A paper describes a structure:
Here, to gain a better understanding of fungal xylan degradation systems, which can enhance enzymatic saccharification of plant cell walls in industrial processes, we conducted a comparative study of two glycoside hydrolase family 3 (GH3) β-xylosidases (Bxls), one from the basidiomycete Phanerochaete chrysosporium (PcBxl3), and the other from the ascomycete Trichoderma reesei (TrXyl3A). The xylan main chain is degraded into xylooligosaccharides with low DPs by xylanase, and these products are further degraded into xylose by β-xylosidases (Bxls). PcBxl3 consists of three domains: (β/α)8 domain, (α/β)6-sandwich domain, and fibronectin III (FnIII)-like domain. The relationship between substrate specificity and degree of polymerization of substrates suggested that PcBxl3 preferentially degrades xylobiose (X2), while TrXyl3A degrades longer xylooligosaccharides.
To uncover the structural differences between PcBxl3 and TrXyl3A, the crystal structures of both enzymes were solved. There is a single molecule of PcBxl3 in the asymmetric unit, whereas there is a protein dimer in the case of TrXyl3A. N-Acetylglucosamine moieties were found at Asn17, Asn40, Asn74, Asn279, Asn286, Asn398, Asn432, and Asn437 of free PcBxl3. The overall structure and order of these domains are the same as those of TrXyl3A. The FnIII-like domain is connected to the active domain by a linker, as in other GH3 enzymes. The conformation of Glu470 (PcBxl3) is the same in the native and liganded structures of PcBxl3, but Glu492 (TrXyl3A) has different conformations in native and liganded TrXyl3A.
Residue numbers in the entry: 1 to 743
């Protein structure tokens, strides 16, 4: 329900005055309320205040890749009825594999539209706990499937697009569409590995790594995209739980990244964890108190509503702290149109007709088609047209709900690889074969019989929610169970053999890489509701592959070279380094790697520049139309991409940078720019524009300070160093962005 501002008990409170300042309306609502009532509404499952006609409002809604199940979400229980389903896009890991920022904005628009409709039905809030922008740093993380990948720059671009699409522009022009929430702020990328439970874990993070790896995405989300909400993390960073750290919430989130009057929710009773099990405060009241003074405005739990009155009476917090939090929450609601009449709000008109739109379904399909990565191919793909009888085998072959990952809703449909092969007209012999993770070989003979007479074999396997999930990290990053044994037995048949490696995290597929009998390999992640159709469109050649790995495929032994608790990224006395930036070993498949159905010849469309003076770049930063010096340009490369093959294809141009100047050691590579060139027909030459910022090229020192250093720099335009360029910066080392030193 919404408050009645025409006739309800608040119709003369300034909150119901539609032309008034939002913060003034929030202050008028808060000032008319009892301290005890305000404390009552410091939690996600807020009762409202019946005395003033303020209805209940639940802050906990989920929409990570489409409207999702949550305490605040209500799917209809009649399967064909209104609000019985919503568009279930692929997991953000495949979305990040697309490297298509525009597509991310479109997907965010669809999600916000459907969420608005559900809220108009009383089946969702106006306020969703998305996105997850913690880098998928360690390959074992059970929640990395929820993220765009392991590169902070890529995550930053992704999250800019997603926040602006979800909230409706860079500002509430009339209103917020929905209020997004970039979540788990501060060093959270671990579930329960080796008994290190997230709710008791202490992330020891250097200042350099905090500023260089763990927070740039929050820069983009909070400072550049103007998110209206941040969620503070379960864990501790350097001894202080996130939600009770005023250095993190005030100095970094609100001040450095400019959240301002935007509100901060805890993770779901992380305030409770500040007491138990973090043992940071010796009482629950003091846990609530220090979390509130640090900057946690609303508690995803009942701890605040049970303790904050005690905390005011014990002088641990003031009534004004509670009032400030409440003003933040209600100001956000005011900017959402909560206290405005629905007559002039188009977003208050969206209904069930606006959910599973033909265009939204096509968009989910397009996302899956651009995200799937072709890891290996010898020409077998796209499938020969004489291929007719196909055996589909594996614990993912007929995957329906598996394709949705976690944090999902109810989809209108789930098109499995099996069904999409049947939709395409193939004569299919299906066999489970074996489970995701078991020692039972009973199904092997059945799969062999399915494959014995076939024209081609499609094995679909990997990991899923039973292997990686919130609260469960992986111990091994190998294929689970005996899946590889069955793939080997199928390869013995020496037929055309295609292997679909699914799941969010990567598994060691090097054995498949080295086998001549495995003719093709694709990573399908969690591909969403139309995943099978996308995969089969790729297999048949109806759509050409173009997706690229958003994370590294590590060799299995990586799990023995570094513990998951090691928050450092640089190589060390005990670490081979983390991510493509620092890993000293040999990935099975590199970050950004991907194959196409055609060849590309790359050259310079404009002659690239050779030298820059640092003071000149800093001076010109003031005169480019950007809000902060780190957002101003270094340059824009123009690359010509000739389709030298015979098949129309997209191409993701990825610009990597390396340097030896400034702080040592330097990363091996950093992704500084990328762009998706669409629909290059055979013979044509398309031009890709690659814009690098001063912030992407500036180095972070031991203090978290980001500066421009004068030295020699190089750039290249694929993982295969497809063209290459050297330039040089000259002048004084000059600071581009400061860093608040830890309290
Ligand atoms: C809202 O307040 C302004 C002054 O702040 C006043 O001019 C206007 O009439 C008020 N509108 C309503 C609907 O009360
Ligand atoms: C706080 O909420 C509880 C549960 O709805 C209710 O019993 C109590 O009266 C509320 N307190 C005030 C001051 O409204
Ligand atoms: C929506 O939720 C309410 C309770 O929150 C429940 O009574 C109702 O049945 C739900 N809607 C449907 C269609 O089941
Ligand atoms: C909590 O920490 C205090 C010191 O900060 C210590 O004395 C106490 O034993 C700890 N209690 C628990 C339950 O961990
Ligand atoms: C509450 O916790 C903080 C930080 O642990 C501590 O400094 C403070 O003394 C505690 N308050 C009380 C009343 O014990
Ligand atoms: C494929 O999965 C669906 C569940 O979504 C099931 O109804 C169907 O029977 C399965 N097909 C086969 C051949 O197992
Ligand atoms: C395939 O797998 C599921 C296990 O989740 C099983 O219940 C199903 O009946 C199997 N299908 C066949 C045709 O044996
Ligand atoms: C597979 O199951 C076994 C037994 O439950 C377990 O020890 C192993 O960790 C599982 N594999 C994965 C990758 O989770």
């Amino acid at each position: 329900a919404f408050p009645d501002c025409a006739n309800g008990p608040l119709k003369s409170n300034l909150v119901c005055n539609a032309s008034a300042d939002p913060v003034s309306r929030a202050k008028a609502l808060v000032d008319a309320l009892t301290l005890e009532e305000l404390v009552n509404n410091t939690v996600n499952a807020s009762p409202g205040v019946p005395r003033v006609g303020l209805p209940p409002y639940n802050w906990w809604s989920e929409a990570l890749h489409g409207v999702a199940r949550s305490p605040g979400a209500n799917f209809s229980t009649v399967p064909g009825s209104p609000f019985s389903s919503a568009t279930s896009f692929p997991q953000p890991i495949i979305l990040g594999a697309t490297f298509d920022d525009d597509l991310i904005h479109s997907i965010a628009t669809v999600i916000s539209t459907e969420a608005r409709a559900f809220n108009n039905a009383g089946r969702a809030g106006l306020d969703f706990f998305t996105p997850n922008i913690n880098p998928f740093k360690d390959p074992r993380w059970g929640r990395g499937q929820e993220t765009p990948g392991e590169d902070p720059y890529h995550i930053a671009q992704y999250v800019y697009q997603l926040i602006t699409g979800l909230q409706g522009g860079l500002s509430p022009d009339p209103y917020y569409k929905v209020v997004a929430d970039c979540k788990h702020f501060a060093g959270y990328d671990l579930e329960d590995w080796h008994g290190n439970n997230r709710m008791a874990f202490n992330a020891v993070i250097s200042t350099q790594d905090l500023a260089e790896f763990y927070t740039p995405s929050f820069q983009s989300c909070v400072r550049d995209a103007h998110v209206g909400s941040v969620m503070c993390s379960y864990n501790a960073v350097n001894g202080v739980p996130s939600c009770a750290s005023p250095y993190l919430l005030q100095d970094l989130i609100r001040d450095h990244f400019g959240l301002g009057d935007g509100w901060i929710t805890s993770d779901c009773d992380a305030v409770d964890n500040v007491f138990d099990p973090h043992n940071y405060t010796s009482t629950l009241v003091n846990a609530s108190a220090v979390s509130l003074k640090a900057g946690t405005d609303v508690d995803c739990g009942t701890t605040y509503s049970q303790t904050l009155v005690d905390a005011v009476n014990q002088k641990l917090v003031t009534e004004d702290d509670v009032k400030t939090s409440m003003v933040r929450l209600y100001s956000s609601l005011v900017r959402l149109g909560y206290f405005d009449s629905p007559e002039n709000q188009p977003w208050r008109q969206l209904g069930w007709a606006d959910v599973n739109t033909p265009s939204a379904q096509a968009l989910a399909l397009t996302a899956a088609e651009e995200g799937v990565v072709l890891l290996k191919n010898d020409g077998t793909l796209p499938l020969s047209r004489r291929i007719k009888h196909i055996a589909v085998v594996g614990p993912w072959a007929n995957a329906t709900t598996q394709m949705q990952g976690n944090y999902q809703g109810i989809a209108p449909f789930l098109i499995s690889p099996l069904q999409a092969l049947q939709d395409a007209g193939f004569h299919v012999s299906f066999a489970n074969g074996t489970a995701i993770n078991s020692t039972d070989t009973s199904g092997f003979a059945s799969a062999l019989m399915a494959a014995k007479a076939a024209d081609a074999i499609v094995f679909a396997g990997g990991i899923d929610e039973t292997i990686e999930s919130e609260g469960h990290d992986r111990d091994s990053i190998e294929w689970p169970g005996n899946q590889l044994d069955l793939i080997e037995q199928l390869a013995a048949l020496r037929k055309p053999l295609i292997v679909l490696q699914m799941g969010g995290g990567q598994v060691d597929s090097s054995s498949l890489k080295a086998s001549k009998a495995v003719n093709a390999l694709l990573w399908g992640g969690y591909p969403g509701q139309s995943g099978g159709t996308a995969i089969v469109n790729i297999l048949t050649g109806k759509t050409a592959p173009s997706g690229r790995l958003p994370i590294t495929q590590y060799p299995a032994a990586y799990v023995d070279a570094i513990p998951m608790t090691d928050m450092a990224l640089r190589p060390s006395s005990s670490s081979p380094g983390r991510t493509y930036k620092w890993y000293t070993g040999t990935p099975v498949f590199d970050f950004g790697f991907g194959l196409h159905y055609t060849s590309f010849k790359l050259s310079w469309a404009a002659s690239p520049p050779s030298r820059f003076d640092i003071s000149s770049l800093v001076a010109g930063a003031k005169h480019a139309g950007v809000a902060f010096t780190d957002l101003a340009p270094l340059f824009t490369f123009h690359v010509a991409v000739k389709n030298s093959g015979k098949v129309t294809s997209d191409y993701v141009a990825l610009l990597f940078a390396h340097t030896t100047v400034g702080p040592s050691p330097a990363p091996q590579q950093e992704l500084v720019a990328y762009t998706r060139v669409k629909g290059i027909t055979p013979g044509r030459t398309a031009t890709a524009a690659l814009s690098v910022t001063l912030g992407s090229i500036a180095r972070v020192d031991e203090s978290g300070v980001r500066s421009l250093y004068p030295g020699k720099y190089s750039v290249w335009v694929d993982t295969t160093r497809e063209i290459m360029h050297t330039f040089e910066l000259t002048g004084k080392t000059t600071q581009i962005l400061g860093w608040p030193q830890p309290r």
